[PDB]
């Protein structure tokens, strides 16, 4: 076949990753173990640990933009509420 350019991942056998020695893997086959292990304990506990770990990264931006949105909405409401003759004109321009 027509040779192609250099590639960072080979196929099986010549996969290209660093050669290693002494690493041992295992398995127990799907049929010899219960499919649903932990199901609830891991569910609740890991779910709460994960939600605790990254809470602030989603809390802070949401709070900031919610504060902006609330302030903008309230000022817009005040603008067109018995204020179209004394405040609307001086800020529209």
């Amino acid at each position: 076949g027509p040779p192609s350019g250099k590639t960072y991942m080979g196929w099986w056998g010549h996969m290209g990753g660093p050669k290693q020695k002494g690493i041992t893997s295992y398995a127990v086959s799907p049929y010899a173990q219960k499919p649903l292990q932990g199901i609830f304990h891991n569910a609740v506990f890991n779910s709460f640990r994960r939600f605790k770990s990254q809470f602030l990264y989603v809390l802070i931006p949401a709070g900031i933009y919610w504060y902006w949105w609330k302030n903008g909405n309230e000022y817009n409401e005040f603008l067109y509420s018995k204020a179209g003759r004394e405040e609307l004109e001086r800020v529209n321009v």
Binding site: Y8, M9, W11, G16, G17, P61, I64, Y65, L88, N92
Partner: protein, 385 residues
């Protein structure tokens, strides 16, 4: 030697569905990409069975939609599935984008992939607008008018090109005829571009969620990840059913169901939800040519992301400030869309201008300086003297 890897028509499918060593630590986002592919294919199929019973003339385009609504056995399902699957396709494509930007798949060894992808993005936006014109409701006519007239900002000769693309001096038979024919054409070009997308992907696998080398261990494609795709596609089917049966007219806007009338327009004309982010930045800056150029400039500033992310450590799985800024950017994006949806008054022009500023700023200057700070902190923390 095994017949799966010998016959050419099957040796192709083997290397892409039956044996493709995906990385060990996959999460649901690449399964989400597979979901997107299946959404595309069901969109194509239902589109064929749609156009099987769709007219093309301007006078008999709306009547064709009501006819596909009711007078065809089991047809309203086809139309709602087409529309809501399109909207869900755009949302899932946006989430595919945001994933790609977060995990640093746009690092150098996949720049061709990322460019091809953003080409699919711009093509798909064009297709959505084309089909929305194909409906020719009430506000779709005005949307077509404005977006065709967009090109008139071109210097010197601008009227001739718009009049050419707009089939005359009025929205008439050639306009919608050409729009529908092109809409029916383009998704096959999308299919060609996405087979190129797959080709470009296969050269170097898929990125780890950890942003680290995945050549160490990998597990075979079939019998492991096919089911990870199956679960998510079943979720998609059920949520689409929920939106197509019980809650049909939510994602879209209840204005398309009006006969076209180029004499009166409602004061509330907005694009569908997945075009609000760009519409906001268009209406933000106070100029015609500036807005027209700055939309495609938003696409180009998406383009410029590689060879700008100068973090030696790939991805944003281990950078608190970088991921915090990415979240501020995505919430920026949704805020931008929503403010675009809302009307423009005194407290909104400044809001939108600042929004566009922080948006483009995140693309241009936030990534490099923050990335450099992260890199220098990483070096300084674990060094004595």
């Amino acid at each position: 030697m095994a017949f799966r890897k010998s016959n050419v028509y099957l040796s192709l499918v083997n290397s892409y569905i039956i044996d493709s060593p995906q990385p060990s630590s996959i999460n649901y986002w690449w399964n989400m990409g597979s979901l997107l592919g299946l959404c595309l294919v069901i969109q194509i199929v239902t589109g064929i069975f749609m156009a099987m019973h769709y007219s093309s003339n301007i006078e008999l385009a709306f009547s064709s939609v009501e006819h596909i609504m009711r007078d065809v056995h089991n047809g309203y399902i086809l139309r709602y599935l087409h529309a809501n699957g399109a909207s869900f396709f755009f949302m899932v494509m946006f989430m595919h984008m945001a994933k790609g930007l977060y995990y640093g798949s746009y690092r150098s060894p996949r720049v061709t992939l990322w460019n091809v992808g953003v080409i699919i993005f711009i093509l798909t936006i064009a297709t959505a607008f084309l089909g929305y014109c194909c409906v020719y409701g009430q506000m779709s006519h005005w949307g077509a008018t404005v977006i065709t007239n967009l090109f008139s900002a071109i210097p010197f000769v601008g009227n001739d090109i718009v009049s050419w693309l707009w089939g005359g001096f009025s929205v008439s038979n050639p306009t919608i005829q050409r729009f529908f024919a092109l809409h029916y054409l383009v998704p096959f070009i999308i299919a060609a571009m996405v087979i190129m997308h797959l080709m470009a992907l296969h050269i170097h696998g898929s990125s780890n969620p950890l942003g680290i080398t995945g050549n160490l261990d990998r597990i075979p494609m079939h019998s492991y990840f096919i089911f990870k795709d199956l679960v998510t596609v079943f979720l998609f089917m059920l949520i689409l059913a929920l939106f197509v049966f019980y809650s049909p007219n939510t994602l879209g806007h209840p204005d398309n169901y009006i006969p076209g009338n180029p004499l009166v327009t409602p004061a509330s004309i907005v694009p569908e939800w997945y075009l609000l982010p760009f519409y906001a930045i268009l209406r933000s800056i106070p100029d015609k040519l500036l807005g027209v150029i700055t939309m495609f400039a938003a696409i180009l500033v998406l383009l410029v992301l590689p060879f700008t992310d100068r973090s030696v450590v790939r991805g944003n799985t281990f950078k608190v400030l970088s991921k915090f800024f990415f979240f501020i950017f995505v919430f920026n994006f949704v805020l931008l869309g929503q403010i675009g949806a809302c009307h423009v008054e005194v407290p909104y022009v400044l809001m939108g201008q600042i929004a566009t500023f922080i948006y483009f700023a995140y693309f241009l200057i936030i990534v490099p300086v923050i990335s450099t700070i992260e890199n220098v902190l990483f070096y300084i923390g674990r060094v004595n003297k």
